[PDB]
Amino acid sequence: GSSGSSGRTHSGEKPYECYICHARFTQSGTMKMHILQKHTENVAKFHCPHCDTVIARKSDLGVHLRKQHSYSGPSSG
Ligand SMILES: [Zn+2]
Ligand SMILES: [Zn+2]
């Protein structure tokens, strides 16, 4: 008993993939944003689509995106 053979070819490289819909992604950011865009309710814990940080709930995310990051309308005031 001793065998071994490989054979897997598929156009398109993506070191990332959604564990919800199996949607491959070539960008770590795109994926994270996809899971929170398509699976915003189908997820308990929330992760920042930018840095590695835990977020209570979606609504909370915004706060972090505004505090830690800069996500707001360009208004003078
Ligand atoms: Zn997905
Ligand atoms: Zn962040």
Side-chain angles (χ1 to χ4, degrees), residues 1 13 17-21 26 29-30 39 43 45 48 51 57 64-66 68-69 71-72 74 76-77:
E13 73 293 271
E17 183 203 39
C18 187
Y19 44 71
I20 302 171
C21 64
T26 181
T30 300
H39 315 293
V43 52
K45 278 270 202 183
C48 181
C51 74
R57 45 211 281 275
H64 165 75
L65 275 166
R66 298 182 303 205
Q68 275 287 347
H69 298 285
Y71 269 84
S72 206
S76 295

Short mmCIF file of all heavy atoms in Angstrom, two decimals, residues 1 13 17-21 26 29-30 39 43 45 48 51 57 64-66 68-69 71-72 74 76-77:
data_model
loop_
_atom_site.label_atom_id
_atom_site.label_comp_id
_atom_site.label_asym_id
_atom_site.label_seq_id
_atom_site.Cartn_x
_atom_site.Cartn_y
_atom_site.Cartn_z
N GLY A 1 0.81 -1.21 0.00
CA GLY A 1 0.00 0.00 0.00
C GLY A 1 0.84 1.26 0.00
O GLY A 1 1.41 1.64 1.03
N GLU A 13 -5.97 32.89 -9.32
CA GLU A 13 -5.34 32.65 -8.02
C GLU A 13 -5.93 33.58 -6.96
O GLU A 13 -6.04 34.79 -7.17
CB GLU A 13 -3.83 32.86 -8.11
CG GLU A 13 -3.42 34.32 -8.25
CD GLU A 13 -3.86 34.92 -9.57
OE1 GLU A 13 -3.10 34.82 -10.56
OE2 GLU A 13 -4.97 35.49 -9.62
N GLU A 17 -10.78 33.31 0.53
CA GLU A 17 -12.07 32.76 0.12
C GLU A 17 -13.10 32.88 1.24
O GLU A 17 -12.77 32.77 2.42
CB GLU A 17 -11.91 31.29 -0.28
CG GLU A 17 -13.20 30.66 -0.79
CD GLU A 17 -13.20 29.15 -0.65
OE1 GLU A 17 -12.69 28.65 0.37
OE2 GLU A 17 -13.71 28.47 -1.57
N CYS A 18 -14.35 33.12 0.86
CA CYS A 18 -15.43 33.26 1.82
C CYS A 18 -15.91 31.89 2.31
O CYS A 18 -16.28 31.03 1.52
CB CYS A 18 -16.60 34.02 1.21
SG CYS A 18 -17.93 34.43 2.38
N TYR A 19 -15.89 31.70 3.63
CA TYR A 19 -16.31 30.44 4.22
C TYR A 19 -17.83 30.39 4.38
O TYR A 19 -18.36 29.57 5.13
CB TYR A 19 -15.64 30.24 5.59
CG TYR A 19 -15.63 31.49 6.44
CD1 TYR A 19 -16.81 31.98 7.00
CD2 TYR A 19 -14.45 32.18 6.69
CE1 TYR A 19 -16.80 33.12 7.78
CE2 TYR A 19 -14.44 33.31 7.47
CZ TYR A 19 -15.62 33.78 8.02
OH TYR A 19 -15.61 34.92 8.80
N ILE A 20 -18.52 31.28 3.67
CA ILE A 20 -19.97 31.34 3.73
C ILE A 20 -20.59 30.96 2.39
O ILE A 20 -21.52 30.15 2.33
CB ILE A 20 -20.46 32.75 4.12
CG1 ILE A 20 -19.88 33.16 5.47
CG2 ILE A 20 -21.98 32.79 4.16
CD1 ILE A 20 -20.14 34.60 5.84
N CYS A 21 -20.07 31.54 1.31
CA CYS A 21 -20.57 31.26 -0.03
C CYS A 21 -19.49 30.60 -0.88
O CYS A 21 -19.75 30.18 -2.01
CB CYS A 21 -21.06 32.54 -0.70
SG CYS A 21 -19.75 33.78 -0.98
N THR A 26 -8.90 37.63 -4.26
CA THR A 26 -7.46 37.86 -4.39
C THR A 26 -7.00 38.98 -3.47
O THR A 26 -5.82 39.33 -3.45
CB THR A 26 -7.08 38.21 -5.84
OG1 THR A 26 -5.67 38.42 -5.94
CG2 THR A 26 -7.81 39.47 -6.31
N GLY A 29 -8.81 42.43 1.89
CA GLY A 29 -9.79 43.45 2.21
C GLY A 29 -11.12 43.20 1.54
O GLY A 29 -12.17 43.26 2.18
N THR A 30 -11.09 42.91 0.24
CA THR A 30 -12.31 42.65 -0.52
C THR A 30 -13.14 41.56 0.14
O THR A 30 -14.35 41.71 0.33
CB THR A 30 -11.99 42.25 -1.97
OG1 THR A 30 -11.26 43.29 -2.63
CG2 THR A 30 -13.27 41.95 -2.74
N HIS A 39 -22.98 38.89 3.97
CA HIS A 39 -23.32 38.15 5.18
C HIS A 39 -23.18 39.04 6.41
O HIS A 39 -22.43 38.73 7.34
CB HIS A 39 -22.43 36.92 5.32
CG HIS A 39 -22.28 36.14 4.05
ND1 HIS A 39 -23.32 35.46 3.46
CD2 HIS A 39 -21.20 35.94 3.26
CE1 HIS A 39 -22.89 34.87 2.36
NE2 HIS A 39 -21.61 35.14 2.21
N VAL A 43 -23.64 36.50 10.68
CA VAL A 43 -22.37 36.52 11.40
C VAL A 43 -22.54 37.15 12.78
O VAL A 43 -23.15 38.20 12.93
CB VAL A 43 -21.29 37.30 10.63
CG1 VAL A 43 -21.80 38.68 10.24
CG2 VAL A 43 -20.02 37.41 11.45
N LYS A 45 -19.76 37.66 15.32
CA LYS A 45 -18.66 38.59 15.55
C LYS A 45 -18.34 39.39 14.28
O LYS A 45 -18.46 38.87 13.17
CB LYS A 45 -17.41 37.83 16.01
CG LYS A 45 -17.40 37.51 17.49
CD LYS A 45 -16.74 38.62 18.30
CE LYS A 45 -16.24 38.11 19.64
NZ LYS A 45 -15.65 39.21 20.46
N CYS A 48 -12.89 44.05 11.41
CA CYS A 48 -12.58 45.23 10.62
C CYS A 48 -12.01 44.84 9.26
O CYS A 48 -11.04 44.08 9.16
CB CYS A 48 -11.58 46.12 11.37
SG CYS A 48 -11.14 47.65 10.48
N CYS A 51 -7.96 46.58 9.49
CA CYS A 51 -7.01 46.01 10.44
C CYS A 51 -7.62 44.82 11.17
O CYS A 51 -8.80 44.52 11.01
CB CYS A 51 -6.56 47.07 11.45
SG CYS A 51 -7.82 47.49 12.70
N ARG A 57 -20.93 44.61 17.19
CA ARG A 57 -21.92 44.45 16.14
C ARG A 57 -21.65 45.41 14.98
O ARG A 57 -20.78 46.28 15.07
CB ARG A 57 -23.33 44.70 16.70
CG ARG A 57 -23.42 45.93 17.58
CD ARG A 57 -24.48 45.76 18.66
NE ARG A 57 -25.83 45.98 18.15
CZ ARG A 57 -26.39 47.18 18.05
NH1 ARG A 57 -25.73 48.26 18.43
NH2 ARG A 57 -27.62 47.29 17.57
N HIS A 64 -15.83 52.49 15.01
CA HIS A 64 -14.42 52.14 14.87
C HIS A 64 -13.85 52.70 13.57
O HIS A 64 -12.72 53.18 13.54
CB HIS A 64 -14.24 50.63 14.91
CG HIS A 64 -12.90 50.17 14.42
ND1 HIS A 64 -11.74 50.30 15.17
CD2 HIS A 64 -12.53 49.59 13.26
CE1 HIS A 64 -10.73 49.81 14.48
NE2 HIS A 64 -11.18 49.38 13.32
N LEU A 65 -14.65 52.65 12.51
CA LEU A 65 -14.22 53.15 11.21
C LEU A 65 -14.03 54.66 11.25
O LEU A 65 -13.26 55.21 10.46
CB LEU A 65 -15.25 52.78 10.14
CG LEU A 65 -15.11 51.39 9.52
CD1 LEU A 65 -16.36 51.03 8.73
CD2 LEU A 65 -13.88 51.33 8.62
N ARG A 66 -14.73 55.32 12.16
CA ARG A 66 -14.63 56.77 12.30
C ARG A 66 -13.55 57.15 13.31
O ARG A 66 -12.78 58.09 13.10
CB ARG A 66 -15.97 57.36 12.73
CG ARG A 66 -17.09 57.13 11.73
CD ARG A 66 -18.39 57.77 12.19
NE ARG A 66 -18.81 57.28 13.50
CZ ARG A 66 -20.07 57.27 13.91
NH1 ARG A 66 -21.03 57.73 13.12
NH2 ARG A 66 -20.37 56.81 15.12
N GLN A 68 -10.86 54.95 14.95
CA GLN A 68 -9.56 54.43 14.53
C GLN A 68 -9.24 54.88 13.11
O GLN A 68 -8.15 55.39 12.84
CB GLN A 68 -9.54 52.91 14.62
CG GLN A 68 -9.19 52.38 16.00
CD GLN A 68 -7.73 52.56 16.34
OE1 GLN A 68 -6.91 52.87 15.48
NE2 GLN A 68 -7.39 52.38 17.61
N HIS A 69 -10.19 54.68 12.20
CA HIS A 69 -10.00 55.05 10.80
C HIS A 69 -10.76 56.34 10.48
O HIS A 69 -11.37 56.95 11.37
CB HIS A 69 -10.48 53.93 9.88
CG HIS A 69 -9.71 52.65 10.05
ND1 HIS A 69 -8.43 52.47 9.58
CD2 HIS A 69 -10.06 51.49 10.65
CE1 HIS A 69 -8.02 51.25 9.88
NE2 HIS A 69 -8.99 50.63 10.53
N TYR A 71 -13.69 57.45 8.22
CA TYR A 71 -14.81 57.14 7.34
C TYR A 71 -15.99 58.07 7.61
O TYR A 71 -16.87 57.75 8.40
CB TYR A 71 -15.23 55.68 7.52
CG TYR A 71 -14.53 54.72 6.58
CD1 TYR A 71 -13.27 54.22 6.90
CD2 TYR A 71 -15.12 54.33 5.39
CE1 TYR A 71 -12.62 53.34 6.05
CE2 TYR A 71 -14.48 53.45 4.53
CZ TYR A 71 -13.23 52.96 4.87
OH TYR A 71 -12.59 52.09 4.02
N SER A 72 -16.00 59.21 6.94
CA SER A 72 -17.07 60.19 7.10
C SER A 72 -17.11 61.15 5.92
O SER A 72 -16.14 61.29 5.18
CB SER A 72 -16.88 60.97 8.40
OG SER A 72 -18.11 61.45 8.90
N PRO A 74 -16.87 64.37 3.68
CA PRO A 74 -15.96 65.51 3.66
C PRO A 74 -16.69 66.84 3.84
O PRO A 74 -17.03 67.51 2.87
CB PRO A 74 -15.33 65.44 2.27
CG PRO A 74 -16.33 64.71 1.44
CD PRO A 74 -17.00 63.73 2.36
N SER A 76 -16.78 70.67 5.92
CA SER A 76 -15.98 71.66 6.64
C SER A 76 -16.73 72.19 7.86
O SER A 76 -17.39 73.22 7.79
CB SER A 76 -15.62 72.82 5.71
OG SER A 76 -14.77 72.38 4.66
N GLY A 77 -16.62 71.46 8.97
CA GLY A 77 -17.29 71.87 10.19
C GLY A 77 -17.51 70.72 11.15
O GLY A 77 -16.69 69.80 11.17
#
